[PDB]
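Case study.
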Amino acid sequence: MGHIELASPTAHIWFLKSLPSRIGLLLDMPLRDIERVLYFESYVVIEGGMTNLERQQILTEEQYLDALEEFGDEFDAKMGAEAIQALLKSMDLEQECEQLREELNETNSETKRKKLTKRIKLLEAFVQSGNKPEWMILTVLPVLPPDLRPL
Amino acid sequence: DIVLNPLGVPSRMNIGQILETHLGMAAKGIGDKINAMLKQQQEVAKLREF
Amino acid sequence: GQNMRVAFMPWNGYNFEDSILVSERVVQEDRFTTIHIQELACVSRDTKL
Amino acid sequence: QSQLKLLVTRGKEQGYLTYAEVNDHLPEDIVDSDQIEDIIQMINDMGIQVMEEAPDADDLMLAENTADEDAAEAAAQVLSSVESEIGRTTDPVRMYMR
Amino acid sequence: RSPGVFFDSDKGKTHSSGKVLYNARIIPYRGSWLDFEFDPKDNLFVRID
Amino acid sequence: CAAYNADFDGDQMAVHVPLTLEAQLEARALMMSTNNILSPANGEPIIVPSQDVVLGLYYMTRDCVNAKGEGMVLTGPKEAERLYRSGLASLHARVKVRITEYEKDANGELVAKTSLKDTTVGRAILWMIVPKGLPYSIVNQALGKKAISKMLNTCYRILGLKPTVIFADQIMYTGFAYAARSGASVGIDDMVIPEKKHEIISEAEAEVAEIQEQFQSGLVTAGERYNKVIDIWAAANDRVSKAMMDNLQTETVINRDGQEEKQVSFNSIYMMADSGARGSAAQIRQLAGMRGLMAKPDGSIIETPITANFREGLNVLQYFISTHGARKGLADTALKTANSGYLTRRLVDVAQDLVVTEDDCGTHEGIMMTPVIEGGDVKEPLRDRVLGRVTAEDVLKPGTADILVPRNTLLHEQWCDLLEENSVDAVKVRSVVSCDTDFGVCAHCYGRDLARGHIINKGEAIGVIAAQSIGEPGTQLTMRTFHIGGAASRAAAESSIQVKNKGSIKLSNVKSVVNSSGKLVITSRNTELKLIDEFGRTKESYKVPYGAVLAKGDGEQVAGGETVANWDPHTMPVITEVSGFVRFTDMIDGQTITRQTDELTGLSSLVVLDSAERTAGGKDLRPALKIVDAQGNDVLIPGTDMPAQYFLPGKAIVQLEDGVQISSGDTLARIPQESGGTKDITGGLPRVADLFEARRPKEPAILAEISGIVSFGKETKGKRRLVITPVDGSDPYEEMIPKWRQLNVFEGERVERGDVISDGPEAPHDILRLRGVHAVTRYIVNEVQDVYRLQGVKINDKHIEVIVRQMLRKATIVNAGSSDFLEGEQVEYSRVKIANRELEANGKVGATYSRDLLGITKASLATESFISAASFQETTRVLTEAAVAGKRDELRGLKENVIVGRLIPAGTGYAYHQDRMRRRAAG
Amino acid sequence: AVGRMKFNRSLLREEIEGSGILSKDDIIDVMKKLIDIRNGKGEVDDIDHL
Amino acid sequence: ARVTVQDAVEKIGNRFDLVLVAARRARQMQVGGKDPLVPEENDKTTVIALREIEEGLINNQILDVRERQEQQEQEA
Amino acid sequence: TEEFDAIKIALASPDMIRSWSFGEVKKPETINYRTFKP
Amino acid sequence: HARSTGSYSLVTQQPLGGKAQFGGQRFGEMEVWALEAYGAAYTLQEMLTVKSDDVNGRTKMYKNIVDGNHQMEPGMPESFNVLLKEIRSLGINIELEDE
Amino acid sequence: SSLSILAIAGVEPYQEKPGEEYMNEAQLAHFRRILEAWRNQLRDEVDRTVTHMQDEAANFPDPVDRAAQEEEFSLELRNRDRERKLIKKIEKTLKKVEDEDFGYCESCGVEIGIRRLEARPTADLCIDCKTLAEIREKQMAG
Ligand SMILES: C[C@H](CCC(=O)NCCC[N+](C)(C)C[C@H](O)CS(=O)(=O)O)[C@H]1CC[C@H]2[C@@H]3[C@H](O)C[C@@H]4C[C@H](O)CC[C@]4(C)[C@H]3C[C@H](O)[C@]12C
Ligand SMILES: Nc1nc2c(ncn2[C@@H]2O[C@H](COP(=O)(O)OP(=O)(O)O)[C@@H](OP(=O)(O)OP(=O)(O)O)[C@H]2O)c(=O)[nH]1
Ligand SMILES: Nc1nc2c(ncn2[C@@H]2O[C@H](COP(=O)(O)OP(=O)(O)O)[C@@H](OP(=O)(O)OP(=O)(O)O)[C@H]2O)c(=O)[nH]1
Ligand SMILES: [Mg+2]
Ligand SMILES: [Zn+2]
Ligand SMILES: [Zn+2]
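After joint prediction, the assembly is written out as follows.
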């Protein structure tokens, strides 16, 4: 087999467009949002420090512009699949799972409780399998042996 | 010349082949009778009449 | 086609199913022998050798 | 209440959904050539794939209805998308054009 | 099918309570279509092809 | 050829060569033609003579009034044959012959009995072949398709394979020989137009003329004319057919020495019909009769018929109509077969993996097999249902502690014969569904029935066997769904019972209340009335509804055809247990009831109005019928403290008003209920698929969840409430029910869990939940098997049973202790963890589970290994999920191993994999 | 010309050849015939008639 | 016994490990380490091994004992 | 040929993708069109 | 039509089907099920691998037949190897584990 | 003539007496007999039909004769379905006779002719209402 060094990190279609979008539910981000992010229409705040913006908040073109102008430093936001990969790498599976368990110990509402449980199971399974989320985004692309795509 | 299975007639509701066999046998009977009257070379008149 | 003398009867299960029994007499007279004209082509190309 | 809440019900309440419906029930926007493709594929995970002009026979539509799974985020996805009317300009041509 | 005007019924299936809803479709040889159709409530609707 | 469904009209066949030595052996042992003569579906032979053979044998055995050598005495069959071949006697002629039959009387000894039988020459010549063990009786008869098949069957059952094979070959050769000697053909004059065709046709035409004249009179719209004409034509057609067949069959009026006689004719076409080689009455009809009415495209039946026959000639119109019908059928056929393929494939996907893994699970549970005694007789006897099943427990003679069948014994033919000699009715048989072993089944619970004779051998893949057996048929079944709604064998009426055979009367599930004349009026909803015969067996079974007056009770002998019960169908009487005056409770005029009262004899038509018709003040007022004594105080129902307060439902016509001393058992108020009384037969192919996909049916009937006195609830909101209150347990079970539901039980009644409350069809899910596993499995088995027998395709229940087991693969946990408390989980993992808990010290907790029933599609979708699921499911989805999950596939299954090209774990390769299991986790 | 012939024949007019494009009086007659069949003074046509 | 192996299954009832035993024996016969114990009728070794099984001379236990016999003999 | 069992599925990490591959394909060309060597 | 050995295809090393080329019938899914109905594991195994897709196995078995020995060497079906290579071409790691 | 609906039973056309009231005991008995005979015949015909279907069904090796044997069965089953639909109509008519509400039009109170009831004993409406309803039906259907 061969491989290609991709210059811009590209998202793996299967983990986005498959009816359950596993990037989306892992990141608890709707599909339309991730779509808008990859196609370069809006930014997302990656660790926006002691500011007025959350960590999975989308910013439009000129809202990001007015913010950067106002918040030059201590403000990390980006666009595209590399932004998605970056925010994916930084998310702490185990600690967030423990938070979820604390919520389960404190939270008493039927449907919300069920949803919480579902997420808890999902994360548990992921961290048990041993796959790190950042791999859903491809950096190197393998190329099939020539004889199987003959000329 | 050919031996055809009878059990194919009644359940295969194509009965026309049987009438075809009968009428064709009759046609060859005529043909034979003419062959006989010609082999003896009877006369124009008799072939004509028949 | 051609018109043959047929007899409707079972002849020791060789016409068991829709199969047909036939006499050497038909093949002897060559009345069901077909001529088939087939075409063959040999093409000589030039390889780089 | 919208113009799809009355559809999604039918889809599984009457078994299928003819092309006519999914055509007129669309909002006003994302009519773009074959934008439907995504909503038809979501509606297909519930069991529809109706023929030219909605025929019928054929007691077999529930095997394929079961062959399209519980996890129905799609429902949420479609709802959100068709409840915001952000132009789903997927084709890069349009976005670069803008 | 020849070009022209056709009056279809598409009966039975129409809401499983009868409501036989008719429609006249005007089809040219080459060009967009005209459709005049009914509704359960007896209202006459136009469709461009 | 019958096995291959092959025909010699240019059909082709493929030929493969087994290469390895083991493959050669595998071909020769399991796959050899001679080893597989028995159909895997039922036990009977497949290789039976097909058409030409049967014609020859039929010709050979038939008897004739008069021929050569009437009344000759021959010293044996060889002399008979010597006589026939010399032309001194006809091949069929009634004759006295000396024959030596052999008998298996001892423990496999042959005892020659040698005496003079009255038979035909032909039958003796045929007897030459018959192997030693068979009784002469076999050949003495006409010897048609049925008889010949029974001949082969008995030959197999008594002697064994090797002789049955040799005897089959002999039968073929002799049949062909003598068929050729017969010289049977088919001439134009052999199909005789019945003399009276034109008579019936003229009658039918005159009748249609009268109906047209009576139409122009204005007594009937067009519809009546159309329907009536079509019906008259149908009757004319069937009568003409019957007249032609009557003319045809027995027309040989051949003469004996002097006067004459009449006999079973020797018309070649007729013999081809009756022998069962080709043709049925209908096709003969279409040659010699009128080919009836035909249908246009739309399904409507055209009024004018053809009336012509193929012997005569049709005309343009008639041929055109016949084209309509023909082409419609021809076009439907292809699709039908191509969809039966789909049914078979989705039936194999669910069951593929099921393999016989264990020798014996050691379970005591089992299914109660009875002779299905539907009313008048034994529609299907026990022996057929129980043959080849292992027993769950010892069966006792009609006298306790007289064990005749030790614990799990395989029931072969002779065991069944012994079982017949006694009169046991019900036998617990170990079933595949209740088999206890996880990850497969046990040899014993399955049983013998296969192409071979013996108990199943360990390792054979039963899942795909059953799927194949259930899929191969299903092409006889008419494609599109049909309906009949006939139920020929009903109960003669709906009111009175009519005992068919003189036997003792015996009641099941009842509590009668003797009335004043002394009749056992039954107040139980679930009552059945059987009949024991001379030697202690259940002959007749009848269903007696609530409130039916009886005449003769229990024990007394009923003579043939006595009306033992009587009641008006559309009338539920309310029956009193004690005597005294009826007191009126909450029956205000205008508020809840409408005064319709009669004169002296005390009749009324009071209608207990519901909330809608009740005025604004009478919303909660439940009008009741108070059971008071002469003194006033509520007399209590015998043994219980409840004063019977019969909340009369809507339209309770209370005849016996206040002031009429009710005898213990007099009807309080007659309530007319016009409940639908017919069980529309359903059938064809799609209904089977629909039954297998376990679709909750239309307006479903409802059941009771827990027991206890039932009660009403919030009045007329669009679904009246039913509150089942347990006498012991907690009260609070409210179930809303639509108004259109008819109720079988009164409000103030104590129902038991899972009795029917409303009429109609029950959803299998409820059956499983309330009644449990054996009830749902029996329900499915019976319901599908009815469809398959409706067309006359015989299948053994075990295959349907394995499938049903595949449908129950899943359960849902409601308790806790180690799981997630709500996950749909296979019953095997739960059962092993329960074994863990119960063998270990700790409960944990727990955990109590409930079974779920899934239709074969979802069940297939619930596969564990992902290579199979990718092989037949949306590959992208399963691959993506398995990639994220890091799931690890041990493959363990059949289809996985197929895909990887290693040894299937079934049959010859089971040992291989079993070996590997021992090599894993070992030294 | 075929389309026009079929249109005019469907509305039972003696005139065979028209101007190809849809004259609006025709449309009005069309709605009249539609509401007629909707009332029941006519049969609907089958897409399968030759 | 090239007609019906019914009697061999009556000897060994598995009907599957039967064919495996017969394959081990018939391969031990083909590769001429041993010779047939039945007078050959110009048969191939398949039906020879089946005929050897049906007379009770060979089964899994007899195969294993004779195999360990030849092994321990050849060790010397 | 190994005797195997248990086929494992997981997301490919970039270092495994580098691990399987023997070389990087930088130019899109396929063959020399004159002499058909790669 | 009959075929013992002949030409194979480029990508899927199956034998070519047809009359111009020797041919080579085709064991389908239904036939697979049929063999599964019997306990016939070795015939299925050969038919699936040594007879079609296993190159080394097929040549070794040819030589074995010529030598008058009848044994077998199934190997991995080439279609399954292609499957692995195509899935691995994606970002999906599929490895044959060991114990 | 042994081909009508009065022929099935051994009954001969009735004859309303001069001062005879409309629905009397004798007429009700007459019509009850007629309907019961009609029903029982139809059920026995269904039993015949089913036995025929159960005997014939077999697997044919030719696709152009499986259609032949499944093109007469389709018509037979059609007739059986229609008669099954008519058995519910007969049952309802037996319920109106048993309830003593037989012989009058369901739309308007007018009584339906006796000769019409001997023509089609299941008649529910008078000829006029029948015709109007038939028009409304064909119009809502087609
Ligand atoms: C020429 C012919 C018309 C003949 C005609 O109109 N005769 C009229 C004869 C009238 N008379 C002489 C008989 C007198 C009247 O009938 C008196 S009365 O009213 O009947 O009393 C028309 C009718 C169908 C038309 C073709 C189709 O569209 C398909 C296609 C469309 C393309 O775009 C152009 C090419 C095509 C091939 C057309 C060609 C041509 O265009 C056709 C043949
Ligand atoms: N199906 C069938 N078989 C027939 C028929 N007639 C004879 N056979 C059997 O087929 C077998 C063939 O034997 P032969 O061919 O004559 O003997 P051979 O091999 O030494 O030449 C014989 O049994 P066998 O093979 O020796 O049995 P076994 O001892 O091997 O178990 C024979 O009994 C027949 O009509 N039909
Ligand atoms: N054999 C027989 N059947 C009868 C007769 N009378 C009525 N039926 C059947 O009973 C069904 C019910 O008829 P209705 O809907 O009540 O119409 P109706 O008042 O004119 O009787 C009809 O089904 P349908 O679907 O309306 O018939 P169709 O539309 O398929 O032709 C019809 O076929 C009869 O006299 N003889
Ligand atoms: Mg054929
Ligand atoms: Zn068991
Ligand atoms: Zn009226």
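Observations recorded in class. The pocket of chapso (ligand 1) is lined by residues E 29; G 1-2, 16-17 (CB under 6 Å). The beta strands of chain I are 7-11. We will return to this complex in the next lecture.
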